Amino acid sequence: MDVMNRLILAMDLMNRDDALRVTGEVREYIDTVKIGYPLVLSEGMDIIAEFRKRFGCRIIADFKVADIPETNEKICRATFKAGADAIIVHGFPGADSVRACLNVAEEMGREVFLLTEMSHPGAEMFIQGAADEIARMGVDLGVKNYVGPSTRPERLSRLREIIGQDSFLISAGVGAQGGDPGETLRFADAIIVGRSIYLADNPAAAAAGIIESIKDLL
Amino acid sequence: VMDVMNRLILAMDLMNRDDALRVTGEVREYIDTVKIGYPLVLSEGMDIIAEFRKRFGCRIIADFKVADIPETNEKICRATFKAGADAIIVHGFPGADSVRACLNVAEEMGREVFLLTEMSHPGAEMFIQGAADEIARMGVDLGVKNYVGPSTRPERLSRLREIIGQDSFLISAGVGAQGGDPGETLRFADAIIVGRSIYLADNPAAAAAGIIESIKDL
Ligand SMILES: O=c1cnn([C@@H]2O[C@H](COP(=O)(O)O)[C@@H](O)[C@H]2O)c(=O)[nH]1
Numbered sequence: 001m002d003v004m005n006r007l008i009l010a011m012d013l014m015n016r017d018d019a020l021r022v023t024g025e026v027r028e029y030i031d032t033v034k035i036g037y038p039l040v041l042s043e044g045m046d047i048i049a050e051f052r053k054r055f056g057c058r059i060i061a062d063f064k065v066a067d068i069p070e071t072n073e074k075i076c077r078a079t080f081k082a083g084a085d086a087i088i089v090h091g092f093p094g095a096d097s098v099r100a101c102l103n104v105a106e107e108m109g110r111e112v113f114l115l116t117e118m119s120h121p122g123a124e125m126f127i128q129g130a131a132d133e134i135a136r137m138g139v140d141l142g143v144k145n146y147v148g149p150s151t152r153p154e155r156l157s158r159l160r161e162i163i164g165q166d167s168f169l170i171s172a173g174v175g176a177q178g179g180d181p182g183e184t185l186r187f188a189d190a191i192i193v194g195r196s197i198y199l200a201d202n203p204a205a206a207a208a209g210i211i212e213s214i215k216d217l218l
Numbered sequence: 219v220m221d222v223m224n225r226l227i228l229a230m231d232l233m234n235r236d237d238a239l240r241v242t243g244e245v246r247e248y249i250d251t252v253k254i255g256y257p258l259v260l261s262e263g264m265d266i267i268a269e270f271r272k273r274f275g276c277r278i279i280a281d282f283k284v285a286d287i288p289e290t291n292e293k294i295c296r297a298t299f300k301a302g303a304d305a306i307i308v309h310g311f312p313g314a315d316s317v318r319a320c321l322n323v324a325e326e327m328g329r330e331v332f333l334l335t336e337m338s339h340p341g342a343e344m345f346i347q348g349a350a351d352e353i354a355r356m357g358v359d360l361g362v363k364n365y366v367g368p369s370t371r372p373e374r375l376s377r378l379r380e381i382i383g384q385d386s387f388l389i390s391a392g393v394g395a396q397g398g399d400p401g402e403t404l405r406f407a408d409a410i411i412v413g414r415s416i417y418l419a420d421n422p423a424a425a426a427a428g429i430i431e432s433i434k435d436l
Pocket residue numbers: 010012036062115117118119120147148149172173174175176177192193194195196286287290
């Protein structure tokens with residue numbers, strides 16, 4: 001996956017007008033948008049097609065899929081029907097639940113991103129101690145796309161070690177949650193950025209600024 | 219605690235609006251509590267919650283297995299309660315801050331959180347099971363009153379009941395299709411969640427009636 005400027009916009013505004021306007025304001029800087037439940041539950045799944053119509057951007061559905069295999073399959077099918085290119089799936093519920101997602105993605109020509117360790121403090125309680133094993137499970141299952149924590153570059157580096165340089169790794173927690181764009185890109189292929197851009201007085205200037213700060217990394 | 223008719227909660231995971239409405243209407247005399255999840259919501263929109271309220275005299279539990287960072291969890295809960303859900307199901311494995319975020323919104327908005335501890339599917343053994351007692355104890359410490367545990371593992375369901383105490387409200391999934399027995403499960407759970415055994419039956423009303431007849435003494 002070729003992400004323009006190594007920068008993925010996390011569009012978590014919950015109003016269609018604002019979401020479309022802000023995304024439009026930064027469109028020259030991105031070609032990949034992560035859409036999650038805040039926007040989808042507020043405005044409907046049709047918003048995904050609307051983003052593709054307006055911006056032609058690729059869409060990663062950050063739905064943290066975390067159900068039993070049967071329900072996971074249905075979730076993935078509904079999501080890809082709406083035009084998502086990829087979906088983010090939790091690994092904590094185990095291999096069968098991940099495989100269910102991999103099956104649908106293969107069937108519809110899409111990608112699964114396996115979330116291994118999360119960026120927030122609560123991730124330390126249970127997720128962090130399982131994270132390496134979750135990553136090895138991804139490797140065993142043939143997962144090629146992963147998500148790890150910008151807020152813990154040592155943990156992000158370990159995740160990269162496990163999955164290898166061939167796998168694709170994106171990372172959340174940049175900016176608002178404290179992660180640094182350039183440091184995160186030592187290990188991740190692309191950074192996810194939400195509030196630092198979409199809550200900024202001038203989102204285009206914010207995006208431009210982040211890109212300037214990583215200009216030597218492409 | 220919520221008064222669940224016949225101790226039976228329908229898991230309405232049909233993805234077609236017409237079918238979902240038909241089947242739910244057919245079993246309405248037996249069930250006043252419906253669990254609506256992402257298969258239906260991502261297919262038909264959050265307005266499906268409104269439609270169920272209008273058509274049936276049923277409480278709505280949104281099974282969204284909320285599993286994000288606190289900031290995103292808050293937004294998901296707000297959107298879900300705004301749409302008319304009485305309660306939402308939240309994962310504990312992302313840790314205490316993530317759960318607290320949901321509890322805070324539920325308190326502010328006058329609704330309820332159900333904490334999912336151990337899941338019913340085979341993959342739950344890989345990571346969730348080993349964390350489940352601690353997740354339950356965490357729920358108790360956070361003041362969580364409503365919980366979800368696995369019908370498929372009576373021994374684990376019994377232990378979860380012990381941890382949360384007799385005053386807490388416990389519902390349980392994995393009954394029927396996944397192998398759980400209604401009667402045994404109700405030794406420990408206040409109510410059972412049943413999906414496919416009802417909604418895939420030639421006669422869903424007869425299926426629900428049969429389940430209820432099998433537990434009449436309870
Ligand atoms: O471990 C994770 C996984 N996903 N996200 C998601 O990435 C985005 C981060 O946005 P932010 O830059 O505003 O913090 C949000 O959509 C959040 O749900 C994280 O923050 N951390």
